[PDB]
Amino acid sequence: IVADHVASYGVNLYQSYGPSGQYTHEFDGDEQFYVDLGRKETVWCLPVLRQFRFDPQFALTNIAVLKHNLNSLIKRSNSTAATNEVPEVTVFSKSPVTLGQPNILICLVDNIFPPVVNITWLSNGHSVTEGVSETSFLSKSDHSFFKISYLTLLPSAEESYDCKVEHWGLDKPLLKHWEPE
Amino acid sequence: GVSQSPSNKVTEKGKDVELRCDPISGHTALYWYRQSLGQGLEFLIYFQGNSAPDKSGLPSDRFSAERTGGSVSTLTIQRTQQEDSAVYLCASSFRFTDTQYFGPGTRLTVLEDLKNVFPPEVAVFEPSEAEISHTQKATLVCLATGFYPDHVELSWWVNGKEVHSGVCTDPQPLKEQPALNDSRYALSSRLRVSATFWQNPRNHFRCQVQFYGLSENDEWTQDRAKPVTQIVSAEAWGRA
Amino acid sequence: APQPELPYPQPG
Amino acid sequence: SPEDFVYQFKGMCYFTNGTERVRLVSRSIYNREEIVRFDSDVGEFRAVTLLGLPAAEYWNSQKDILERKRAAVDRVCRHNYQLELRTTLQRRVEPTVTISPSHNLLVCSVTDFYPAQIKVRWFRNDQEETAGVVSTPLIRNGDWTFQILVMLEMTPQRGDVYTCHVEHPSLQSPITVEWRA
Amino acid sequence: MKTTQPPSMDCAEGRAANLPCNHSTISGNEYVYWYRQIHSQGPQYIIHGLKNNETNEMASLIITEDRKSSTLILPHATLRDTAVYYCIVLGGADGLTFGKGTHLIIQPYIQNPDPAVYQLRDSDKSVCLFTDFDSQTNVSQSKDSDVYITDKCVLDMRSMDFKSNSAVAWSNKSDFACANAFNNSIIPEDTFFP
Ligand SMILES: *[C@@H]1O[C@H](CO)[C@@H](O[C@@H]2O[C@H](CO)[C@@H](O)[C@H](O)[C@H]2NC(C)=O)[C@H](O)[C@H]1NC(C)=O
């Protein structure tokens, strides 16, 4: 429970929904890499870690075990479905705003369970598909998750932004506004 | 342990074959191997559950593998070639990446024509009266000759039941025409008993050779008997 | 190469 | 609100005083509830919930499974730590310190730094301000950079100098940005 | 990480057989696995270790402090230990690979060898049996193709606690006789010929 450094080698997740799964290694709450189970390749987050090789066959076979474990646990619990948690959304910038210069807008979506979420960005009510990146589902001690979306932009006094988050724990789509001021 | 069926398979080229592997109960990971004296031990395909993640390792578009149940697995070699002749091995571990335990294998032999297939000729050679009077022991020698293709298993049966003590079979059969590719084989075995045991005429000595050849499914055009999977023996009684 | 921890199969 | 069943596996490593203390806790979680787990300090599988009892007794009766899990603290944790030492542990990102008045309020924006370890102080002249300060929590951007904002309630006057003192492991000397009226 | 080990080994029965293996490029997480294949059979797992000198009912494994070399110890070698021994390294997802291994042949002491070439009769074609000869003497394949000579194989009479080496020779040729049968090899000077 109490340590200088905590690491997950790794975060094995598999849900019946898709059916979908996720493999990640985390070190001190940050994603080291993810394995694109479809493309069958390891995508490293930090450019220093690209000197390493993680075999995608590890993740693929680990997910084949969770597929088995999930079906077994559905039978044992007698189809005890996951309860949809109310997520916590926060929108902030990576650095202080000065309009001319380039900044990144961050959308924290904490307390996610089950890990099924749709994070989208909006500029004056219009959707923006350009310069948008998203992290993988990052583990939490209470066995819930948190995801982070990014929107690279050039701040403008008139241009406003909103974070469109979709989760089953919400009665209506959540929209967190961001004013450059 | 890991079960494998059939123990042997003699087939003609262009035919399709099925190789079954029953792994140890509770083992969710299965591995397929190919072992030839020429080519080493070649990893073919593995399974973690009922699905194979990597379809590589398989030689050609003729090599496929299925494990629908999530236990027993089948390896299918379709329209077989001479190059496919090998001992097909199977291993299992509880989980992928775990300690692997191997089965007895499947000896597969693919031929150009079945006209070269022959059952063995088994002959039992009684001990030398010189040996009995010299070392006070009696060696019975068995000879399995002129058989192709060489899937044989030699055993000795003394007074009804099988024996192991005082027996020595050759590990590899010799070629009768070593210059020729398609050459008939020969295998020998020794059964050594005490002079007194051989001297008793009530004692029965029988040499048994289990040949694996053709089947009811295969065709035979020749005049001679179909060289089908059979047991050929040679018996001798004690001499006073 | 980072070494992963392995989940074992649930009975049965 | 579709039905969804979740299974998680977390191979977790806990390090303290460098290489001195190493503990592996491999958790098997159904939905948001951990059912069974393997701890290096106990040396065997122990069920957290009744749902984990069939998995624990089964896996504990398997000699090949126990051997693998008992050697995992060295093969996974102690091994992967060596790779972290030249990689993640050696990562140093120097923070950017900016003071923005909000004037009765003063906010010290300490952005884009790694590791998470930081200490930031407010000074009036040579005096250190402790009573009138409120620092936000440590914000995790998720891209291996952290940020923190330290607010100070102040009564400005002519000649006054408000200093923001920042200490980070990436710096052998602190960064002291000053704000003048 | 790959392994190198002596291609062949000959050890006396009753004494401990120590099989060496070299694996300098091994990593910390990798295990040393020892398998054996007795000839006509599928492989058989013996032992495995990571760092500690492991011991089980079958054999013992000792890994050096630098982990670059390991040894397999078969406490009291028997004719049942005659097989090819594979030393492999595991491993991640990469998978098992067998090298040429160590073809270990366990030789028996022949207490009092009385080499003899005996002629046996059918219960035609007559066979010549070279028996009760030393485990140090090597038998050679026939020069003439019309003559057939098997290599030596050790017999085990547990009924009397006696072991003997034996080679068989036969031919339909008129030339063939037990006197010229094993004339192709380094046959001992004191060989009996009835
Ligand atoms: C997230 O986005 C997906 C894709 O737009 C949504 O899935 C669709 O849902 C409608 C019903 O609302 C279905 O008719 C479509 O077939 C679905 N499309 C796909 C691609 O699956 C989903 O509803 C969104 N919201 C959440 C909370 O997941």
Rounded Cα distance between B191 and A54, Å, is 57
Method: X-ray
Residue ID of nearest Cα to ligand 1 atom 25:
A166
The structural domains of chain D, ordered by start, are: 1-90 (3.10.320.10), 91-181 (2.60.40.10)
- Cα D3 to middle of ligand 1, angstroms: 14
Q: Cβ(B121)–Cβ(E117) under 8 Å?
A: no
Parallel/antiparallel/unpaired status of strands E102-107 and E127-133: unpaired
Asked whether residue E23 falls in the same domain as residue E81, the answer is yes
> How far apart, in Å, are the Cα atoms of C11 and each of A60, A67, B92, E8?
20, 13, 17, 44
Give the integer Cα–Cα distance in Å for D14 and D34: 18
Enter the CATH code of domain B113-240. Answer: 2.60.40.10
The minimum CA-CA distance between C11 and chain D, rounded to whole Å, is 6
The token duo for D99 is 């003071």
Q: CA-to-CA distance for B142 and B122, rounded, in angstroms?
A: 7
Tokens at D74, concatenated: 């060295």
In this structure, are residues A36 and A22 in contact, taking their beta carbons and an 8 Å threshold? Answer: no
C-alpha torsion C12→D5→D9→D14, nearest 10 = -140
Nearest to E5 by CA among E52, E55, E59, E69: E69
Q: Provide CB contacts within 8 A for D168, sequence distance 6+.
A: D94, D95, D113, D117, D118, D119, D175
**CB spacing of D62 vs B94 below 8 angstroms:** yes
> Do β-strands E69-74 and E60-63 pair in parallel, antiparallel, or remain unpaired?
antiparallel
Burial class (CB in 10 A: 0-12, 13-18, 19+), A25: buried
Give the residue numbers spanning the domain of E183. Answer: 109-194
A118 lines ligand 1 (CB under 6 A): yes
Over its C-alpha atoms, chain C yields an Rg (Å, rounded) of: 11
Distance between first and last Cα of chain D: 56
Query: Do E34 and E103 share a structural domain?
Result: yes
- Cα gap D91→D130, rounded to integer Å: 31
CA-wise closest residue to E87 among E39, E30, E41: E30
> How far is it, in rounded angstroms, from Cα B155 to Cα B167?
9
| CA atoms within 13 A of residue E161's CA, in its CB half-sphere | 1
Q: How far is the CA of D30 from the centre of ligand 1 (A)?
A: 25
Half-sphere exposure of E139 toward its Cβ, with a 13 Å CA cutoff?
24
Place of tokens 């040499």: B207
| E167, E73: one domain | no
Sign of CA dihedral B52, B56, B57, B63: positive
Neighbours of E121 (CB within 10 A): 12
Q: Using the structure block, give the residue that is written with the tokens 């289990």.
A: B210
Is there a single domain that holds both residue E78 and residue E121? Answer: no
Kindly state whether residues E130 and E51 are assigned to the same domain.
no
CB under 8 Å to D102, separation ≥6 — which residues? D151
Give the count of domains, chain E: 2
The answer for residues whose C-beta is within 8 angstroms of residue B213's C-beta and 6 or more apart is B10, B117, B119, B149, B151, B227, B228, B229, B230
Tokens for A16?
């019946």
Topology of the domain covering A82-181: Immunoglobulin-like (2.60.40)
Backbone angles phi, psi at A70, to 5 degrees: -60, -55
d(Cα D138, Cα D118) in Å, to the nearest integer? 9
Answer yes or no: are the C-beta atoms of D110 and D174 closer than 8 Å.
no
CB crowding D15-52: b at 16 or more within 10 Å, else e: beeeeeebbbbbbbbbbbebbbbbbbeeeebebbeebb
Judge whether E160 and E125 are in contact, CB under 8 Å: no
Instruction: Output the CA–CA distances (angstroms, integers) from residue E64 to E1, E2, E56, in the order listed.
Output: 16, 16, 18
Q: Which of E108, E125, E144 is the last residue of a domain?
A: E108
Q: Which two tokens stand for residue B92?
A: 């299992």
Residue A42 near residue C1 (C-beta atoms within 8 A):
no
Q: How far is CA D139 from the centre of its chain?
A: 10
Rounded Cα distance between B197 and E160, Å, is 13
Q: Do E12 and E89 belong to one domain?
A: yes
* Cis status, amide bond into B6, omega within 30 of 0: yes
Residues 6+ apart with CB under 8 A from D137: D148
- Which residue in B8, D33, E84 sits closest to A142, CA to CA? D33
Q: Using the 3D structure, point to which of E108, E123, E154 is the last residue of a domain.
A: E108
CA–CA distance, E142 with E181 (Å, rounded to integer): 8
Q: Is the domain of E153 the same as that of E96?
A: no
| E35 plus E120 within the same structural domain | no
Of 3.30.465.10, 2.102.10.10, 1.10.1040.10, 2.60.40.10, the CATH number of B1-112 is 2.60.40.10
Q: Is the CB of A167 under 6 A from ligand 1?
A: yes
CB of residue A147 inside a 6 A radius of ligand 1: no
B4 CB-near residues (< 8 Å, 6+ apart): B19, B20, B21, B22, B89, B90, B103, B104, B105, B106, E42
Contact yes or no for E31/E89 (Cβ under 8 A): yes
Co-location of E101 and E178 in the same domain: no
The secondary structure of A73-97, three-state, reads HHHHHCCCCCCCCCCEEEEEECCCC
Beta-carbon separation of C9 and A68 below 8 A? yes
Residue ranges matching CATH 2.60.40.10 in chain A: 82-181
C8 with B95: Cβ contact below 8 A: yes
SS3 assignment, position A42: strand
Q: What is the CATH number of the domain that holds E8?
A: 2.60.40.10
Tell me the count of D-E CB pairs closer than 8 A.
Answer: 14
3-state secondary structure chain B: CCEEECCEEEEECCCCEEEEEECCCCCCEEEEEEEECCCEEEEEEEEECCECCCCCCCCCCCEEEECCCCCCEEEEECCCCHHHCEEEEEEEECCCCCCCEECCCEEEEEECCHHHCECCEEEEEECCHHHHHHHCEEEEEEEEEEEECCCEEEEEEECCEEECCCEEECCCCEECCCCCCCCCEEEEEEEEEEHHHHHCCCCEEEEEEEECCECCCCCCCCCCCCCECEEEEEEEECCC
Domain boundary (E91, E108, E125) is at E108
CATH 2.60.40.10 intervals, chain B: 1-112, 113-240
Q: Where are the alpha helices (DSSP H) in chain A?
A: 56-77
Q: Give the other-Cβ count within 10 Å of A115's Cβ.
A: 23
Given resolution (angstroms): 3.0
CATH code at A3-81: 3.10.320.10
